[PDB]
């Protein structure tokens, strides 16, 4: 129990920031909020990488930039569609992390 709780104190808040902001993206309907949500999301993706698993976040950060680029142009509808593919990769890192801890 102590070892499992130690892992939560390290990276669990980072995964809470990623998931909570992943619901704002699918709920907001303007490029002002999609870009704002992804900005907070990326800062958490880099933060979690600091703490093969590291290469997993390079795919995650790379997909945030690709979705943030579309939302920067003002194509809010495409950004939400592109953030859907982000959820599957983010979910995979969860299952890979829980197996290691």
């Amino acid at each position, epitope marked *: 129990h102590a070892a499992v709780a130690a892992a939560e104190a390290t990276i669990k808040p980072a995964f809470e920031t990623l998931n909570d902001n992943l619901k704002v993206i699918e709920k907001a309907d303007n490029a002002a909020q999609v870009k704002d949500a992804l*900005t*907070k999301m*990326r*800062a*958490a993706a*880099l*933060d979690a990488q*600091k703490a093969d698993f590291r290469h997993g976040f*390079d795919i995650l*950060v*790379g997909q945030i*930039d690709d979705a*943030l*680029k579309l939302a*920067n142009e003002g194509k809010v509808k495409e950004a939400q569609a592109a953030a859907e593919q982000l959820k599957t990769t983010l979910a995979e890192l969860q299952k890979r992390y829980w197996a290691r801890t």
Partner: antibody, heavy 124, light 108 residues
């Protein structure tokens, strides 16, 4: 040796148009996005615009969006910044930065190499 | 986002220790860089990733991170480090904001 040089700065009438070019030598523009940052006389640095020639993307600062149009030409290995409808607050020295591509170390380097910078002044 | 840098001007003589504080408005992970602009010339990179050291600069320059509060520390001001230091964050290509700028001056 990696270096960047600018040109085109000079006296311009308010509401006129000026073109700045950042001739990059020592590398390829396709491998590094080029950014433009300006410093008003006696103030701190400020971001202006950037282009990622490999992906074709382009973003501008909220203070200059809709006027400036930054384009890159890999054949001539340069990067241009077309400036239209210049106002009185656009007098500054425009430095041409450089930045790597995610992932890897070069992204973390940030603006490692800078240009000399050209002075753009609007005059009546 | 927004970046705040303090102090805006400090004085320290040769061999003194200088600490410059830079606090981001929101979390930027560890994407912070420090530049040194000599008067009338292009800026030079000193610290990248807020804790590393760019190759080719004297080893006295040091960086630190404490949550969202960043710090640049100079161990001993030789008579070549009296210039303006800017705190930059580079969270993304389209969200680059620089600090106000700290100027180091001689003391008498």
């Amino acid at each position: 040796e990696v270096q960047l040089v600018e040109s085109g700065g000079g006296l311009v009438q308010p509401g006129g148009s000026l073109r700045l070019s950042c001739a990059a030598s020592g590398f390829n523009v396709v491998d590094f996005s080029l950014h433009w940052v300006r410093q008003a006389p006696g103030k701190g640095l400020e971001w202006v615009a950037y282009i990622s020639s490999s992906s074709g993307s382009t973003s501008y600062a909220d203070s200059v969006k809709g006027r400036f149009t930054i384009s890159a030409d890999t054949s001539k290995n340069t990067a241009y910044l077309q400036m239209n409808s210049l106002r009185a607050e656009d007098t500054a020295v425009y430095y041409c930065a450089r930045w790597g591509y995610w992932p890897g170390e070069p992204w973390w380097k940030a603006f490692d190499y800078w240009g000399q910078g050209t002075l753009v002044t609007v005059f009546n | 986002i927004q970046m705040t840098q303090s102090p805006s001007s400090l004085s320290a003589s040769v061999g003194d220790r200088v600490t410059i504080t830079c606090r981001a408005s929101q979390s930027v992970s560890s994407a912070v860089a420090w530049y040194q602009q000599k008067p009338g010339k292009a800026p030079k990179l000193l610290i990248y990733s807020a804790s590393s050291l760019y190759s080719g600069v004297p080893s006295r320059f040091s960086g630190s991170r404490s949550g969202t509060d960043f710090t640049l520390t100079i161990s001993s001001l030789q008579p070549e480090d009296f210039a303006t230091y800017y705190c930059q964050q580079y969270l993304y290509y389209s969200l680059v904001t620089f600090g106000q700028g700290t100027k180091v001056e001689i003391k008498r």
